[PDB]
């Protein structure tokens, strides 16, 4: 997980400040999800407007690998263009 396009800018023992680059102008807004890498926890999510490329993920747990994913939401139609998600694993 060496090069980046979604990255952790800042971090505390209970949080992560993430950042990413806009790549699909046909986006409506972004969807962020996060949960323990092992996937034994539920995966929490929130949305961000189209023009925002930064976020804070609070209340995390130390010594816990977290998989953070970001999606460029277009719509949810059977035939609308659906872009691939981008993610990283942290701590």
């Amino acid at each position: 997980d060496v090069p980046r396009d979604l990255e952790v800018v800042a971090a505390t023992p209970t949080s992560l400040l993430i950042s990413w680059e806009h790549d699909y102008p046909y986006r409506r807004y972004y969807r962020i999800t996060y949960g323990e890498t092992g996937g034994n926890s539920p995966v929490q999510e929130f949305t961000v407007p189209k023009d925002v490329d930064t976020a804070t993920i609070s209340g995390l747990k130390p010594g816990v690998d977290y998989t953070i994913t970001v999606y460029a939401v277009t719509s949810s139609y059977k035939y609308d263009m659906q872009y691939s998600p981008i993610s990283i694993n942290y701590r």
Binding site: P25, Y26, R27, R28, T74, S75, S76, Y77, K78, Y79, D80
Partner: protein, 141 residues
């Protein structure tokens, strides 16, 4: 006789850009006239005889300019200031003119919003075919 391949390539590329520049749908969501193989818009077909393909492209462009200038698009609910429909329409006109210079009803507003999405999706597919045609023609003819 030369349909100005380079200018057509540049215009068709801009049409592709415009068509994907903005998402059509609003705060709105839901889950649920084509260039065919026989139309000769494939490389081998453009090689032999390009007039067939270009006539099919011209007809498609006129088809979309008519839809974009219709009450589906003009009129309520009014298009947002970020809509590329204005520019798309002008570019469709621009291109149709370079090809041949010399010379099904909206009712409820929720139905126009969905129709606009559908037309624009179909337009994206069409313009991409046209862009590949003009790029290949520019490079090989």
């Amino acid at each position: 006789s030369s349909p100005a391949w380079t200018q057509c390539q540049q215009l068709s590329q801009k049409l592709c850009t415009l068509a994907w520049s903005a998402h059509p749908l609003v705060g709105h969501m839901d889950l649920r006239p084509h260039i065919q193989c026989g139309d000769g818009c494939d490389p081998q077909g453009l090689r032999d005889n390009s007039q067939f393909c270009l006539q099919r492209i011209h007809q498609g462009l006129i088809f979309y300019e008519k839809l974009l200038g219709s009450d589906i698009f003009t009129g309520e609910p009014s298009l947002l200031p970020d809509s590329p429909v204005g520019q798309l329409h002008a570019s469709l006109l621009g291109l149709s003119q370079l090809l041949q210079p010399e010379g099904l009803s909206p009712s409820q507003p929720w139905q126009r919003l969905l129709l606009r999405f559908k037309i624009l999706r179909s337009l994206q597919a069409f313009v991409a075919v046209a862009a590949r045609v003009f790029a290949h023609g520019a490079a090989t003819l």
